[PDB]
Structure formats: structure tokens, C-alpha cells
Amino acid sequence: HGYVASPGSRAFFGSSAGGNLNTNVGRAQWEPQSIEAPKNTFITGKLASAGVSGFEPLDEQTATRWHKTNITTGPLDITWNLTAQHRTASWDYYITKNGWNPNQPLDIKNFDKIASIDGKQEVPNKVVKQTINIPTDRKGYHVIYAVWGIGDTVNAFYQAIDVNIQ
Ligand SMILES: [Cu+2]
16 A cells, blocks of 8 residues: 655545645545555546545546646656555556647546556565656646556556646
8 A cells, every 4th residue: 555645646635644735535535545456457537546446536537626746847756655565566657648638537548658667576665766757748737647566466556646747
């Protein structure tokens, strides 16, 4: 169990630690660390919740529904916090393509992968800091999809992150 704390994930922003910058986020208010589903689950319109019971409110998609972190193109530091550390296979990062539609359900086919970090089947620390590159054809509102793949289970944790690139 874990979440992306910086830039705050959509679920994390639903919690008091995230400043309640998103309202009406279901289970994300209290347990943004709990978005666990099998690896390679990418159901259109169910990316933010990973299809998990109680996280449905996260799946709403409009241009103005969610709080964004202002970022630039180029390097971006990602910080995860793990409430329960697990042996790790992988960390994968995706971002919406230039020209995507922020008022349509999220579809992984409309993202590019932009980073992939091998977990080496080791147990990470409670705070994990990584740096990924935001491509320079992205401007304005985008969604980063951060995926922590567990080493000793068939599952992953899924973190949609709303950013405003300027
Ligand atoms: Cu866990």
C-alpha cells in the first residue's frame, strides 16, 4: 500500500494530508494508499479507481473537476509514500498525449509510457523518490499515471496525478 505524495495524486489530494484539495473522493479521503488491482488492469473510465470498490468517485473526468499541481516540462520528481512496504518488481509512468480530451473517460490508449524503473525484487523504503522526464510537447492539463508493480503478488498500485504544465 502506497500513494504518490508529490506531485499529489488525485487520491492523495482527497485526504487531510493532501489538504482536501479534492472533494468527494470516496475511500481516497481516508486510504489513498489502497488502490490495488491486478497488474495490467487498464479499464477505460476506471483508471483513477483501478475499478476498486469505494474509489468510483475518482473516475469522474472533466477539465475542472480535479486539483492540478503546476509543473514544467522536463525533469519531474515523483515521491511515493508507502504505508506498507512490499517487495517491488517495477515502477511505470505514463502521461496523456498532446491533444487528449480532458472531458472524456480516461483510456490508457491515449497515454504514452514515459518512464520505467526496475524494482529489482527488493523492498523499498517508506519514502521513494524518482525523477521522470515530462516530454516537451505537453502543455496545460495532463494526467500522469503512476503504477507500482508488486514483486511477490500479481498486483499493482495505481495513482492518477493531475498536473498543469506551463
Ligand atoms: Cu500493501
